[PDB]
Design a protein around this ligand. Structure first.
Ligand code: UMU
Ligand code: UMU
Ligand code: UMU
Ligand code: UMU
Lengths: 261, 261, 261, 261
């Protein structure tokens, strides 16, 4: 089975990658980073986020596996000491695939750029006040004045969305969550304040009022966009597939990361 | 078609109820408050909450309609001036039914009491510190020390859940949201803090650690329970059905109630 | 010098109290719990809160010292192993006194009851909705609809006030902080939301609108008051005096309790 | 008495400025924008913030007066229709001066730049993660990982500080308030979360851990600083003086801006 391994680049990860490649050499495994079917990420969530975006063109043909050699590693399922057991089970061929929802961002100018997000997509102004009109399913909902907005995937609700006061969403729910970044609320300006959870087929559209330049982020990326007509959020039809070998429930994954471990 | 009308009891609502009953007398409508198929609530959300719990035994045979003669009326779809137009359209027979998810609470002693909630169910201690262990799908998640907890339905996320910092959930999502009530967090005590959104088939169980007496609420009700072994939260299989005659999206319903109208 | 020692009542604290009394027998120390000048609390903040209220009539003649045999002990300055060093230094007579501001609560009926608080005073309704008008210096400020309100002292801002989202206030600032308990905010109801920090000589008055029965708390006490005309908050002119033997800054005291130790 | 008038630059403000100058020509008033003793700002808080920073070198010789021709105008005391009454009373010479505390920011490189703030000073990274060690009075308190930090003056607590969850502080209290901007908190990263209120003579120092480039803001200004060794916060010894002609308490000023008017 075709596979590839990406590494954080530090000593522990590079060496662990070579050992697994040597271990995979003892099975019917072929290293191919062009068309892999198993993508193994050795590092942290940042290394895992990069592996996902490196292969977003074949998310339907790829199952992801995360080994964390770092501090937290929310998307990882493996310690480095358990690596040789992973080589064997992945070679045995039997494991189960679980799928998490993804976010779709479409940006329009005056062409059209689309993006896929595993954690979240956020909007901020390119210096100066950030003002947008929030349109939900072609109905105007509010005018946002603040630092920015964050639209999160389910599995991304434990990341940036959490620090903004958002709720934690189990990834079996196909939804997206929008949170505020320090909105101004007074006699003249009024926002909902609360986070909003949108289901599938619901389209959130941001429309500029004054400045049309915004710094848009997709996970670790941060892009500057000029002459923006509209930013559109939507639950993607594509999903990310994880190869699972034991039971690690999302809520237990939450407990270990934030309560104790 | 069998129907009944409940009223807040004030002058405006009682008179509006008599006019509609007289108006329904001009159609093939029969007043029956024992086995109605249409339940019309004239008043506020409190009047509507009471109508729901008055007929929770036949939620599969009943469609609800809300007329608000009060201040907000989140569950209402009608102004009192539009009442005679409602009599006609409901008599015409053609309207569409929409269904919102409900919450199930099961309380255990040492028998078993169950409840259905449209807004939320909350737990507090019967005086003294409130301490419970939070068990999600038979896995211990946290020990909560604070004033209480609130488990909300989707349509109830705009109510008590909102004031506790929870997120607003579109009612097409079959979920329940758990929020905290002033948990203590220090070197010794640690909670997740963030609200939690659970899908269907997920069972949240609260287990006492010290005191076993808790004041449990279901919407406007507030009960004292003694010798409690376990409180269990779960998305109900039963749903509440609304009779809709025009389009009033949940997000527009949110906008009018909190932004402006 | 006259002194007394109060104890949590468990084995470790009672024995530690007897050892110090025997140790104080080797100096010019006299045990007097009627008119002490040094009050030593062995236990936790709850034990310390009780010692303060046990002697609130002579707060100008008394310096307090806290030994924590429990979990956190925010008001304590001593481990039980350091106890015999405390007997010696307190006998040596030289230590410095620091003073923290106190809160004054005045409740009026239709007589007048006053209270002193070290942590906070909170108001809730006696079952049913809690509605009060908030009057700051005889000017109406807002109508509060929610679960309750919390007025905190500086040293009490790390307690209940903190869990409600309040700010942490250094006790050299003579102020009181008012925080909300789950206020309802919509088209009809509007509160400030933010915590409010009032200086000395500023009088916060709560005035009932409907129900006149409220459950008022002062630290660990919780009282039911009937026929309430007014609840009044104010920075007390009396202060609590602490006997300090080494430097333990408030911010370092904050760090150990909430960051790590 | 020497005075000057600054204007937002729009039609209503420029014309109002000319009318007052013509009105002041009927008294012993001399227009001098080099060494004025009365500075009148016609516009909004942004226009008022600019007038303050335009004359921060003579804050001890200057009393400020605000006329708001815009939307909110928190620092203003006058409607444009009341302008001719202001010319007369200011000419009559009798009014009372009130003083608000100011914030001092000192930035160090590897020289030393200082700034005075009326609202707040905030720190963010120059792209990339923002990590600083928070040192209070030479004692390390926490390592902050997030978007940034905001240190506010009392009168500035109703501005940016409020949108970040901070408390509202009466300006008779000589203090500064530090709030967080979306800190990350998990098993590895831990911050206090709560806002912190520091008294006079308390020195908050931010110390870089990785990147030494930060975008520092002072009110409406935003500067990029390179090779930063330390950012230092402190309650200034200088204060801003307001000319007051009637009673407008800070809490009533708060009520009008956020509750209703
Ligand atoms: C700059 C401060 N960030 C970090 O240091 N991140 C790393 C920490 O994030 C943990 N982590 C990541 C991830 C990742 C790496 O990519 C950058 C991501 O950074 C996040 N982010 C941005 N700004 C943030 C902010 N202010 N507060 C909180 N998070 C913020 C955004 O989600 C962005 O996608 N995913 C998750 C996750 N699903 N669940 C739990 N933890 C996660 C990860 O293990 C590590 O601990
Ligand atoms: C005591 C303070 N409550 C109220 O005054 N309620 C009435 C206000 O609630 C509005 N309203 C109700 C409802 C109802 C009546 O029943 C009592 C309900 O009260 C709520 N509640 C309890 N304590 C609360 C608190 N502290 N803050 C906020 N809400 C709290 C609990 O949900 C409990 O079910 N439903 C909703 C709704 N889906 N969406 C939007 N608004 C709603 C309603 O129209 C009215 O404006
Ligand atoms: C019921 C949940 N409480 C507790 O368990 N308290 C004990 C914890 O409080 C710590 N502690 C106490 C104190 C005390 C004992 O008295 C009861 C006090 O309880 C508080 N309280 C009430 N309800 C609360 C809530 N929901 N959340 C948070 N705190 C709440 C109210 O301030 C009330 O005065 N003082 C402080 C303090 N200055 N700073 C830091 N920690 C403190 C103490 O060491 C222990 O850890
Ligand atoms: C970009 C979004 N800002 C605004 O639009 N500001 C204007 C609104 O601020 C009101 N206003 C100002 C001021 C000012 C102008 O200068 C810029 C200031 O902007 C603030 N600011 C920055 N980012 C913010 C954010 N995310 N949320 C909230 N406020 C933020 C920062 O304090 C910075 O000093 N002072 C105050 C004040 N003391 N009290 C009450 N309202 C005030 C003012 O009248 C107007 O309504």
């Amino acid at each position: 089975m075709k596979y590839m391994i990406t590494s954080k680049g530090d000593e522990k990860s590079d060496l662990l990658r070579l050992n697994m490649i040597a271990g995979f050499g003892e099975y019917d495994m072929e290293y191919d980073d062009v068309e892999p079917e198993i993508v193994i990420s050795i590092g942290g969530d940042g290394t895992f986020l990069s592996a996902f975006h490196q292969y977003e063109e074949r998310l339907d043909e790829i199952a992801f596996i995360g080994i964390h050699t770092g501090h937290l590693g929310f998307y990882a399922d493996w310690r480095p000491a358990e690596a040789d057991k992973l080589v064997k089970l992945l070679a045995k061929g039997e494991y189960q695939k679980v799928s998490y929802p993804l976010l779709k961002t479409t940006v329009k100018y005056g062409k059209e750029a689309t993006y896929l997000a595993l954690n979240e997509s956020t909007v901020k102004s390119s210096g100066g006040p950030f003002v947008v009109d929030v349109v939900i399913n072609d109905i105007h909902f509010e005018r946002f004045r603040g630092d920015g907005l964050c639209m999160s995937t389910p599995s991304g609700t434990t990341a940036y969305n959490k620090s903004l006061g958002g709720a934690l969403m189990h990834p079996s729910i196909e939804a997206m969550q929008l949170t505020e970044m320090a909105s101004i609320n007074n006699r003249v300006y009024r926002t909902i304040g609360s986070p909003l959870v949108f289901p599938k087929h619901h389209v959130v559209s941001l429309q500029p009022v004054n400045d049309k330049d915004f710094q848009i982020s997709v996970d670790h990326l941060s892009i500057l966009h000029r002459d923006v007509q509209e930013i559109r959020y939507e639950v993607s039809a594509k999903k990310i597939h994880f190869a699972r070998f034991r039971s690690f429930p999302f809520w237990r994954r939450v407990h270990d990361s934030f309560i104790e471990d």
